[PDB]
Amino acid sequence: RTFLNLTKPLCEVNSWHILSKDNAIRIGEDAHILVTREPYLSCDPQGCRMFALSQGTTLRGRHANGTIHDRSPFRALISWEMGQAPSPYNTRVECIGWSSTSCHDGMSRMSICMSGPNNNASAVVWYGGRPITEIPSWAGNILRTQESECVCHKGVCPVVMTDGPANNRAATKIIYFKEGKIQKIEELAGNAQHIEECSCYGAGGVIKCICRDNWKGANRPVITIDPEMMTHTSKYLCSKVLTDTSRPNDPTNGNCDAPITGGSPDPGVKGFAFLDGENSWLGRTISKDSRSGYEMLKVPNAETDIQSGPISNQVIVNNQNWSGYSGAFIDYWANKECFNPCFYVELIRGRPKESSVLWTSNSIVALCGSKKRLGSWSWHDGAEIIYFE
Amino acid sequence: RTFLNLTKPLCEVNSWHILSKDNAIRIGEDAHILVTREPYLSCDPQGCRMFALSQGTTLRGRHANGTIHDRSPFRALISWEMGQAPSPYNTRVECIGWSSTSCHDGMSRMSICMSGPNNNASAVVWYGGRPITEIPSWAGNILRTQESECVCHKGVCPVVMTDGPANNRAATKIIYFKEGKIQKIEELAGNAQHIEECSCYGAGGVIKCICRDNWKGANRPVITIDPEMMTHTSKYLCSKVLTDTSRPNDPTNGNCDAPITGGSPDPGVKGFAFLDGENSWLGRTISKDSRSGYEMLKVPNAETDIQSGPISNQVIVNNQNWSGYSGAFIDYWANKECFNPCFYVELIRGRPKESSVLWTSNSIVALCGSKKRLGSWSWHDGAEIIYFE
Amino acid sequence: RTFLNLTKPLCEVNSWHILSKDNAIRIGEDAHILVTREPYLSCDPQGCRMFALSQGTTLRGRHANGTIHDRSPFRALISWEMGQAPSPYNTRVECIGWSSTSCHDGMSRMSICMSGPNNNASAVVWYGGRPITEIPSWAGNILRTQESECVCHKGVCPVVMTDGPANNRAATKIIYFKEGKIQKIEELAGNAQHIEECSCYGAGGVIKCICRDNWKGANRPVITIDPEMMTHTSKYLCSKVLTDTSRPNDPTNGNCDAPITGGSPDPGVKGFAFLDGENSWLGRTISKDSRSGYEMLKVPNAETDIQSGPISNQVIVNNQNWSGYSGAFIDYWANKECFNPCFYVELIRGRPKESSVLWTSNSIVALCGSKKRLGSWSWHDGAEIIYFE
Amino acid sequence: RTFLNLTKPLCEVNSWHILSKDNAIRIGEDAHILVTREPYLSCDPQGCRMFALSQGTTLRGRHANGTIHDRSPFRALISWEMGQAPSPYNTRVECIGWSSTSCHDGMSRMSICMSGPNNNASAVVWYGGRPITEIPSWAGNILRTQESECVCHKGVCPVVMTDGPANNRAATKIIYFKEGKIQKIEELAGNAQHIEECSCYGAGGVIKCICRDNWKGANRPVITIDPEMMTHTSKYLCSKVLTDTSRPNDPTNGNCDAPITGGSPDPGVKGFAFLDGENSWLGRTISKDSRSGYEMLKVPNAETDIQSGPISNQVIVNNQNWSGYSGAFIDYWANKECFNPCFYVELIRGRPKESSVLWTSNSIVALCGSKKRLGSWSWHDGAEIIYFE
Ligand SMILES: *[C@@H]1O[C@H](CO)[C@@H](O[C@@H]2O[C@H](CO)[C@@H](O[C@@H]3O[C@H](CO)[C@@H](O)[C@H](O)[C@@H]3O)[C@H](O)[C@H]2NC(C)=O)[C@H](O)[C@H]1NC(C)=O
Ligand SMILES: *[C@@H]1O[C@H](CO)[C@@H](O[C@@H]2O[C@H](CO)[C@@H](O)[C@H](O)[C@H]2NC(C)=O)[C@H](O)[C@H]1NC(C)=O
Ligand SMILES: CC(=O)N[C@H]1[C@H]([C@H](O)[C@H](O)CO)O[C@@](O)(C(=O)O)C[C@@H]1O
Ligand SMILES: CC(=O)N[C@H]1[C@H]([C@H](O)[C@H](O)CO)O[C@@](O)(C(=O)O)C[C@@H]1O
Ligand SMILES: CC(=O)N[C@H]1[C@H]([C@H](O)[C@H](O)CO)O[C@@](O)(C(=O)O)C[C@@H]1O
Ligand SMILES: CC(=O)N[C@H]1[C@H]([C@H](O)[C@H](O)CO)O[C@@](O)(C(=O)O)C[C@@H]1O
Ligand SMILES: CC(=O)N[C@H]1[C@H]([C@H](O)[C@H](O)CO)O[C@@](O)(C(=O)O)C[C@@H]1O
Ligand SMILES: CC(=O)N[C@H]1[C@H]([C@H](O)[C@H](O)CO)O[C@@](O)(C(=O)O)C[C@@H]1O
Ligand SMILES: CC(=O)N[C@H]1[C@H]([C@H](O)[C@H](O)CO)O[C@@](O)(C(=O)O)C[C@@H]1O
Ligand SMILES: CC(=O)N[C@H]1[C@H]([C@H](O)[C@H](O)CO)O[C@@](O)(C(=O)O)C[C@@H]1O
Ligand SMILES: *[C@@H]1O[C@H](CO)[C@@H](O)[C@H](O)[C@H]1NC(C)=O
Ligand SMILES: *[C@@H]1O[C@H](CO)[C@@H](O)[C@H](O)[C@H]1NC(C)=O
Ligand SMILES: *[C@@H]1O[C@H](CO)[C@@H](O)[C@H](O)[C@H]1NC(C)=O
Ligand SMILES: *[C@@H]1O[C@H](CO)[C@@H](O)[C@H](O)[C@H]1NC(C)=O
Ligand SMILES: [Ca+2]
Ligand SMILES: [Ca+2]
């Protein structure tokens, strides 16, 4: 019917309610479920779908062996009806490659996938299921993007992409698309020193992207995008509550304008946050060292006050269970007068933390905000690894 | 499309014709069929569909082991095309949780699931495939609901929920919904002493819910709802013909206002009845001790006459086979001048009655009223347990 | 969309071309294929589907064992997109039971199934996917029907049914439906002495049904129905070319008005022919004793001349391979000025002919006429029974 | 919705971007994937689909054994959503047989399959999912066609067919269709000496077909068709860059009007090229002897200059991996002012090159033109033959 406008404010959030869970690993023990990683969700005027990067093999298949590997010619972005597990019989192939993003502009879905060798990858940008535009690498070092949904306003959909070293300064750009065609390209500007795997959402005409600094900061960079002017600024989350993985203990003060460093042994993980003054929530793994457990912390003024701490918390996945990437999404077409925050968490099973199996895959759980105070429990993966031995 | 208005009477019923049967256990022995329980059926303007709570594993998979357990973070309400068996490939996830209800108001389907730990469950109410409202536990003891369809009139859909002990006085409420939003909440009133798992149907502007008293009565409670004023009354089925399971022999007289006690060893099962004067039918298991066999009895005036007995009978499942839950639905959108009574019977296989397997699951059979005098036979499950050993 | 009128003549047929083949057994050896029997095809404004009675188990499943049995509470009529093999994932349940018919009247599809014990069966008649009418057994002996498509004219669809012994005089009726409601019922009239499994088609306002006399005749009965007046007559195929299975050698003369006896060891099989003066074709098995091979014979005047012999032939399945039931259907909605005859052949595999396995099932092949002189080859099933040992 | 016409010019092409890949052998090691060969892709106003000839058994099934054999009554043309692997659950049967072509005219799709014994084969021509025409073998020796998409202009769709010897002079015709009806038949004319398996595309009101001369030449025949006059001419690709398989080294000059002999040990393979002045590209396998590797060569004026050589190259499948047939297609309904070239490569696994398994099958990769300078990597099949032993 119409191009989506981001005019609505964000809903008040006081707790999180379950939206969907696919139990993909429990089911994939017997049924023919695709191996995946890097999942997310995205909505359109008719409902929500799950997305992820297949590895082009089933979980029980002998080719599941060696699926710790991030990049091959056999991966592809695939989408399916929210709640089902991803099989070869229920999935649509959005595009071919090993890094992706996707979003619907109110009229049609744009989907983007990078593929190719490390020194020569390229993106193919699709719209309405047809390929529209190709983008070659500009720094010859693994051209990559969000791994969760992008956001559109009046037909303009910004996408953050990076090309360059994972462990040093790199070349990030924001590309503004309309119907899959490049409208403008900007070089990253501001105080964020390294940008990866941006988790983005919109409200009141503004798009905010909470990302992964894989170089220095255990605090997460924040890009603020104006989709009408097609301009942006960048900096860090102000809060002393650090939310990247492999982080040190939370300091006495955060820093709005420079990375807070430290932690061991990993340099980062995709994550997210909703930032709306008092109404601010940050997610993070529970363990400061590894991708284990997951908590949501309500931290008033996190985007602007270096002394902000948590006033409430919700365990999403207990610390005895494995988590992974986490990213934001919103059902912008809800029949509501405010945009209601949602998020998912990738439940990674297999290697390298579970090395008694030869594969690496995941399942999905997703939740959405509530104004009420709802009880909670842990929504871990649920599969028994001994069954796959 | 318009709102369903309950303007028509019940059709006359003199026997029952076969509507559907999914043979899920038979087919699940090889093809990839999800483990379920608490199934049911519900219709809309286009047709009827089957529903149940998945356990988030297939029947031959290793995770089927332990599915006797009722509540987990891996259960969800799923629905599918009537007659098909539920596989991971042909089921839509309606909501996540371990107790549910659903119904179509003539415009869209409302679905409701409860999830969470015992002392802190919440319901999420969906409308048109999107989440609308959340309701937290009010008594801190397994908030739960019907396990069969709800019924709407002019957009108003009442739901019965209980929170509190299973073996003592609890806190039942009736919640009136419209487009997923709460219109009114009433506390349970009248002579019913305990309320669970109501099976409801509509005719002539009036909604009747036949329930499970898990505390005292082997006679079933009956709530009568007026969807327009949003008020109700409650009492017991008067008839001496007892229909709950683990019940004593039928006494000389029933009791309209108080429970008839006795029976061993189990406190109750979900069941149903159609109450319409002379045109009244009661379902029950054939065995008075176990969930085995299933019979329909025409007992005129069962609703109001403590002396009422059966005038005809129809065996639905012979007493050499396992039954389970049973509930009501109607195709309110049929091209008829009256509303024709339908019902389903859950056919439970595995534990605890068949402990040579490690799982528990169910198939479905469903039948509807006929004014003719149709022959009958047993519609048992039909799987051979030894093939699963 | 309007009601189909049989306003057109039969196309001239000089040859038969391949329309569809599902190869269900070859595929069912590994993938999850439902056991069936008694298949057929039926078309509507949009296309053609295949139909069959499922046994409620896959072919490699342990419940395939014992599927020689014709009647059980686990059978159902299922329909699927023409060409595919029937799996639990791509099949629609039309109705429940162990004998059926189905046809489209231009607006919606009517499907009918009979179920129940031998001395008490009943038919349920469906229209647009809803139950409309119920019909109790009238002779207390396996109420049963065509096992191929019925035909409609101005919204009236006649159906031929039989109740009574298989080896003696039985009671056959013609029931005329309109949107699944009974318009009129007639007892069988004329000189056919027993009727079973009618294969019917329409042309120039007249319905012809070629049937199976299971009692005495190796020649097949023919019923001619006028769908506007709702009347019929009956007799036998006049040709000396006998086409039932288990027949004696063709005699010097046929018999229009009485059965011709003889044949070992089978009392009959479902069959068909198209009867149109010089343009007339008779199907039959190649073997006179058994369900083996299949051939099409152009026998001018077979309907009126006891001396009529073949002038052209086409082998459809060679005599080293198993056949089964056969029946007529036509795509009444084709973009052609005449109605072109089509037919299928059921290819039975397993018991009793192939007793090294425990099951009985089938695949399908279908063909339609051509005015050209096309070459041909055998379309046998194609599976290797050793693979299932 | 209208008849497509071919007035637009070909897009400029400087490199090739990934369009789709199905990973069928990888996924079919465990999931239930049909065995195929002779694939291609074809598009319509809604998108693009993959096509291939099934062998009517899955890859892991016992009936896979023996699938090197080309012709059987079990083969059929199947199509499915682009990117998925072909299983029994998501594939549409287009027509029955062992050699095919198909294409959409902007209103509906035409599909053609040949079937039958070597000496008496026949083609059935389908339009909009309905059979329209049959055509008998004229030379009595494996009537056969393109094995990739045909092309349409203003309702007229030409198709190239051959009947006659594989290793000598044969009888090739062009038949012109409109809604499945024959508008004209022509004998092959011009200097091409033998024609098989033409790969065709349209531009500037003209259709060019790049074929396989199986008789003498390692250079490829080129048939130029005018779909308005319904007439054609023929000769050979002029370039010294030879593109058929089993070919000698490239000579110093090609030959426009006669075959260039040599190569061992195979007489040819299906291949393609796009011919547009300086904007011309030729595909071929990397190995001169065998179906291994695959490369794209930009060769300015290949269609007219015998001295023309490559100015740029892109490896599509490396020379350590198996390839196979290759063909052209275009998405004629893209939103662009030019027709952008696309192509596929068939990735043959199993026999005869990999004789440790009993089967032959394939997977698919397809790419399209880019005006940009995109990097590349190999798109080989991906499966480990040792997992099938
Ligand atoms: C039922 O579930 C609800 C929702 O999870 C629980 O409410 C949570 O309760 C904990 C502990 O009472 C609260 O932690 C308070 O947290 C702040 C910030 O972390 C901390 O500074 C305080 O010392 C205190 O621990 C948490 O805020 C609250 N989360 C909510 C309401 O979202 C409730 O406890 C559960 N009820 C039962 C009976 O288990
Ligand atoms: C055929 O089925 C019908 C329907 O169930 C049977 O009719 C019932 O008859 C029994 C025995 O007289 C009564 O107790 C029931 O009240 C009747 N029930 C209904 C629903 O009508 C009939 O008995 C069966 N006939 C045979 C020969 O078995
Ligand atoms: C294209 C690509 O390789 N993406 C990968 C990125 C980057 O490798 C790192 O963020 C370092 O840049 O993150 C992962 O490796 C990771 O941390 O689990 C997974 C993901 O597949
Ligand atoms: C899922 C899991 O077991 N997490 C455990 C982790 C991991 O074992 C290590 O991080 C792996 O190196 O160790 C902890 O000390 C932690 O980090 O909180 C306890 C936690 O329960
Ligand atoms: C929410 C929940 O656990 N519901 C369960 C109820 C309750 O146990 C009783 O109604 C007592 O409240 O009945 C069952 O357990 C049962 O008897 O088979 C099944 C069902 O899953
Ligand atoms: C399915 C089945 O076998 N049911 C039988 C049951 C069960 O064996 C017990 O309930 C097990 O506890 O026992 C009966 O006496 C009964 O309950 O009526 C007879 C009935 O045939
Ligand atoms: C309802 C029913 O059982 N129909 C069956 C009929 C009857 O046996 C005969 O027509 C005698 O009435 O034919 C079969 O048995 C047969 O010959 O293979 C198959 C079919 O299932
Ligand atoms: C499929 C097959 O082998 N059919 C053969 C049959 C069967 O073997 C017998 O009917 C077994 O009862 O026997 C024939 O004489 C016949 O009936 O025509 C020859 C035919 O080739
Ligand atoms: C109908 C048919 O058999 N087509 C086959 C053709 C012809 O055999 C040859 O082109 C010689 O005519 O090509 C193949 O054999 C081949 O070379 O791989 C495969 C294909 O199945
Ligand atoms: C996939 C593969 O292994 N290809 C190899 C082939 C084949 O082994 C032979 O053609 C088998 O006949 O041999 C080569 O010399 C060639 O043809 O270029 C090297 C190439 O790497
Ligand atoms: C797994 O892959 C490794 C390396 O590719 C190989 O050595 C090993 O044999 C494979 N293991 C299995 C169980 O397939
Ligand atoms: C079944 O589950 C129990 C408890 O988790 C476990 O001890 C046992 O090993 C499992 N048995 C099988 C056969 O998987
Ligand atoms: C070709 O199609 C275009 C677009 O619909 C149309 O404008 C044009 O008239 C057509 N050309 C011819 C020659 O039919
Ligand atoms: C494969 O087919 C051949 C020839 O039909 C046969 O000899 C052999 O037994 C079959 N092999 C297998 C493993 O089935
Ligand atoms: Ca970091
Ligand atoms: Ca009770």
Ligand SMILES: [Ca+2]
């Ligand atoms: Ca007979």
Ligand SMILES: [Ca+2]
């Ligand atoms: Ca050649």
